[PDB]
Amino acid sequence: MDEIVKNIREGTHVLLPFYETLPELNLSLGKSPLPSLEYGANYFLQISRVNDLNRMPTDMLKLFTHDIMLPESDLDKVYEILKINDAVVADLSARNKLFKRERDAIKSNNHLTENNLYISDYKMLTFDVFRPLFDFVNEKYCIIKLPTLFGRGVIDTMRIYCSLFKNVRLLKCVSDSWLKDSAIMVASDVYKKNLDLFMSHVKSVTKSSSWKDVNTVQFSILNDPVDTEFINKFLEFSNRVYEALYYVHSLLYSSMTSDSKSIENKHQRRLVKLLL
């Protein structure tokens, strides 16, 4: 598809709307909300190639991705383009990492037990995604590199930010990894009314007015799902990212499973042109 290659090679973005009214808050620390089909979970698009690459040996994943893992430099460029030197920032990404631990092939007859990759992992989304709001004061921008677009928590989190700031953009940069479902939120033009209501709620729970890293855990914050319309506008973005990832990961899997049984094959070659 030409939209896949356009997105990988130029980037893509969505503008999200401003919601005067903050949803009912109910921060809870420990466990994140579950992915669900109501929140746009699509296991064939978002997950199935990830399960294939999980099941490979990490030594082999390392080899077949050596030449296409670049240093992720998307936040540095975002700073530059927005002539920042201001802005509060958080990075929940796994910069220059793809897998969490060395692991052998999972045998054919064994079904996958946990996600070893930093891809489509809703558990990466820890409560420090709201760390920038504590040391917020008078900054024009709140920039967050998200680690995933998978699951319910990342959508509920963008819904909160969309009441806190009047201009919220979700994007994925050319100089991010297109092996991973990371993205950047750029918010600007804060709305004190709700920043204050949010922080009051959060502080009555953590019972501290400054950040403690012990609170960098998984979390849930909303109860009632969000307006279907909002999920759908998010998916306008995440669908395009997962569609690009799906092709990327399909080339990789085809290469790693080629009859050639070598790293020089038609799929590996096409994957290099795509990403570099």
Curated annotation (Swiss-Prot):
GO terms for molecular function: mRNA 5'-cap (guanine-N7-)-methyltransferase activity. The keyword Transcription applies. Pfam families: Pox_mRNA-cap (PF03341). The keyword Transcription applies. It is found in: Virion. GO terms for cellular component: virion component. Keywords: mRNA capping, mRNA processing, Transcription, Transcription regulation, Transcription termination, Virion. Its main location: virion. One of its GO terms (biological process) is DNA-templated transcription termination. Signal peptide: none annotated. Belongs to the orthopoxvirus mRNA-capping enzyme regulatory subunit family. Interacts with the late transcription elongation factor VLTF-4/OPG110. Interacts with the late transcription factors VLTF-1. This is mRNA-capping enzyme regulatory subunit OPG124. It comes from Monkeypox virus. The lineage of its organism: Viruses, Varidnaviria, Bamfordvirae, Nucleocytoviricota, Pokkesviricetes.
